[PDB]
Amino acid sequence: KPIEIIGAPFSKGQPRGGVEKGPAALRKAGLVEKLKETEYNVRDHGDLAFVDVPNDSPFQIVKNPRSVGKANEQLAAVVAETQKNGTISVVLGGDHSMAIGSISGHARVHPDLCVIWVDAHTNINTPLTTSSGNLHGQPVAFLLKELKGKFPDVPGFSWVTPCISAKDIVYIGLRDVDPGEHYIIKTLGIKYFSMTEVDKLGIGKVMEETFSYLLGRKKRPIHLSFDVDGLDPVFTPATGTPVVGGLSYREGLYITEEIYKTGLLSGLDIMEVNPTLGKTPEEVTRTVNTAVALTLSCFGTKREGNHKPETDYL
Amino acid sequence: KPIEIIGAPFSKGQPRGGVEKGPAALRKAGLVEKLKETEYNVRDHGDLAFVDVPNDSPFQIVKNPRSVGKANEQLAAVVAETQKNGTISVVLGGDHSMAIGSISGHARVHPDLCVIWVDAHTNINTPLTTSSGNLHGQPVAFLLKELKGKFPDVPGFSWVTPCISAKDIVYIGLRDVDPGEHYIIKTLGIKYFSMTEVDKLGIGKVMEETFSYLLGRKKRPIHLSFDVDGLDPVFTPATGTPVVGGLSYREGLYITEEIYKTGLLSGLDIMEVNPTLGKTPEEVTRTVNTAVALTLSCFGTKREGNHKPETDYL
Amino acid sequence: KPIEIIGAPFSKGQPRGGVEKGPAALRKAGLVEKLKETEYNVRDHGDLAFVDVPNDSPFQIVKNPRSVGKANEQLAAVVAETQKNGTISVVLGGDHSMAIGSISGHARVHPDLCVIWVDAHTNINTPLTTSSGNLHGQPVAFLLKELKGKFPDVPGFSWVTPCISAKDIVYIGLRDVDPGEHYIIKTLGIKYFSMTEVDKLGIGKVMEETFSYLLGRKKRPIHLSFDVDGLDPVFTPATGTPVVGGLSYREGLYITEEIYKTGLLSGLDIMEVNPTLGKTPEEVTRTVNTAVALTLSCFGTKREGNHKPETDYL
Ligand SMILES: [Mn+2]
Ligand SMILES: [Mn+2]
Ligand SMILES: [Mn+2]
Ligand SMILES: [Mn+2]
Ligand SMILES: [Mn+2]
Ligand SMILES: [Mn+2]
């Protein structure tokens, strides 16, 4: 199978500059070369160049609406392409607001996809419920069908079409949810595994249930949107919104190893890696290294080891 | 329901000065204000003023017997009072020796209560088995009924009446138990989940079993006496007796979230927080912050989020 | 029962000097004295003096073959001896290549023994599959019966006799396996629990299955060969090959506590402790301290506590 790396060095989805440097840091770490060592064919599409919308006045509270809306429109164009050629898209973030265009483009080709959102947040704030106008915490609001018309149209997002419903998404790792977001997920009945469910069940049983929930009836493509703050700050410290008591390095790898095993991975997002937020160079090395390790586990790298088929090592 | 914070800035239960500053640190951190944001009604009773017993000569090995005995007599007068008005008592420690008066007063109003003791120690050393005369490691000895008359009467504790039996208590997080204490718990058959049981079972199944053990037959009020060294030193470093290999931040919160769900929390003790033992300001912040987080989870704060009833956020 | 400490300050099994200092570090930490406090009789045999083979030319890729082969021939002589007097052998490493003579000598006296290998690696590289000629990553290749004649005879190892079969060994903690090694374990069908199985099952269920697998039919002596990099670098940083995402301090102790419980521990290897690889004195302290804690805990020290029999502490 083919893999296409897509760099989305974008940061207007939030106030902390630095996430744009994410793709570079991940490539600098040898992400592309390491992937080629796997059984997949790898093609690096390079980094997208995002045109900055001048005079991007805030829409009520929402900041940089047009810049974000445009960058995502361009990204969804690119993704919907690579998918068309039947390749697996891998988007290197920049902030999680780019999930809008990554999933949108993906859905255009595979309308029956389901999503597994690993994060410490929901990001289902609507332009009306955000305490801050930051879009990185609003991605899912723009995508769901149920939240259609429940908030005013935003400048630059008119091209967006709610592609997935509340039944097609599952959250894993939640631990920092605003009152508004919590109201939303409870009301729409969205399936989620907050850290307390993970503690109660064990990452093993959690993956078992997310699969039977999303793939029980129909086998469909899976879009894994991974926010790096999904794991505890001890493993991925260089992010903008670190929350204590998250997913361990082991639980994170377990999740990607399983998803690999389903053989249904299609889209993948490695978001929020911010190289400039590391207190020491080591914190940054730590962060990037796990991110790379996750990506790698999504495409086959097993902890138990790997050996090339047809090769008699004896 | 009503909540009553009661500060017990006491430290004579052990040699390291500093725990008396615990209540201040917890309030300074915004404990009371944060609680008011919960569905409970909060009333701060302030800090108790403990009269120092002059010429408090040690009883054999036991140090400051009268001072400790008196401070506890006063604290269980206060607790028995608030419980009488049907409010939930929350005691902010100093040292764990104050559990004597916290549980004594509580038992006066609710004689059928059961205890969940989170800690790395048992604190069931009797005045005859302690290697040190420190009372903070002897609380439970004075409470249980089975250990009645198995040790000489101590100066200042004649007011104490063994209120709970070996069947009404469960330990969680044990990892540093003296030979004597281990003899006692084995002999009296006290239910406990040391770190090895937690490793074997997983915090989820441990809470399941403590509940069926203590509430299987009769539903009764629960008194959660939380020693902050119950968690690993990496989360709560500012304590007097830190032991490595303890409960994680996640496991600690899991235990309080569950207890909240039983709807039977009646008394709570947040003990051993010593602000002066933090090697760096951050260590102290870390400690205080999770202590507050635990208290908050006992009264509803869920990791999956919270939303106010009857409020349509859309 | 009798215990015999045997120091193997050897390091030619790998390129990083320092592991020879392991035994001293462990003794300096009070390992022997602390053991005497247990119910076992302890005898320190001292450190073996290994004669250096001059002009030890590499065999193809394999480095220091003769020096390593000889040191192990001497070690297996010593071990086979103490076992013959019915005492439990405890080998303090240098590098894990010494497992060859530790297990060989042990098997001479107890041919029906089974092995529990805790490590992040397999070390089942054969002289033909190693990418580096380092022997510390080839121990198991020389011991297995199934891998007999699958590789050229190496200078100095002609005294070795494959003592255990693929059915007598279980790995726990794997997370860094070369393609060749992975081919080998899959082909020979060796039972293992990599970090993903530990995540899926929980250390509790893992130990349950390794026992039923190795002791289900016949109760036989157990040789625990512990590689200190088996735990995560956060607990045992001072090693030559640290791999992230390993066994926690708690899981490591759980494993030794269970093995003690079987009452079948016969041989024990505490390998790879390298005092010179600690970035700070604390890292080295940390490492040695848990190594000592594991050894203790192999011989009875329980987290729930210990009390001497027949002693009425009341
Ligand atoms: Mn996030
Ligand atoms: Mn996110
Ligand atoms: Mn304690
Ligand atoms: Mn305590
Ligand atoms: Mn190893
Ligand atoms: Mn090894």
From Swiss-Prot, chains A, B, C:
Inactivated by diethyl pyrocarbonate (DEPC). InterPro entries: Arginase, Ureohydrolase, Ureohydrolase_dom_sf, Ureohydrolase_Mn_BS. Mn(2+) 2 binds at D119, H121, D227, D229. It is found in: Cytoplasm; Cytoplasmic granule. One of its GO terms (biological process) is positive regulation of endothelial cell proliferation. Pathway: Nitrogen metabolism; urea cycle; L-ornithine and urea from L-arginine: step 1/1. The modification Phosphoserine is found at S57, S67, S158, S212. Binds 2 manganese ions per subunit. It catalyses: L-arginine + H2O = urea + L-ornithine. Pfam families: Arginase. Residues 1-22 are annotated as: Disordered. One of its GO terms (molecular function) is manganese ion binding. Changing H96E: Reduced catalytic activity. No effect on manganese binding. Key element of the urea cycle converting L-arginine to urea and L-ornithine, which is further metabolized into metabolites proline and polyamides that drive collagen synthesis and bioenergetic pathways critical for cell proliferation, respectively; the urea cycle takes place primarily in the liver and, to a lesser extent, in the kidneys. Functions in L-arginine homeostasis in nonhepatic tissues characterized by the competition between nitric oxide synthase (NOS) and arginase for the available intracellular substrate arginine. Arginine metabolism is a critical regulator of innate and adaptive immune responses. Involved in an antimicrobial effector pathway in polymorphonuclear granulocytes (PMN). Upon PMN cell death is liberated from the phagolysosome and depletes arginine in the microenvironment leading to suppressed T cell and natural killer (NK) cell proliferation and cytokine secretion. NCBIfam families: rocF_arginase. Belongs to the arginase family. This is Arginase-1. The lineage of its organism: Eukaryota, Metazoa, Chordata, Craniata, Vertebrata. The gene is Arg1.
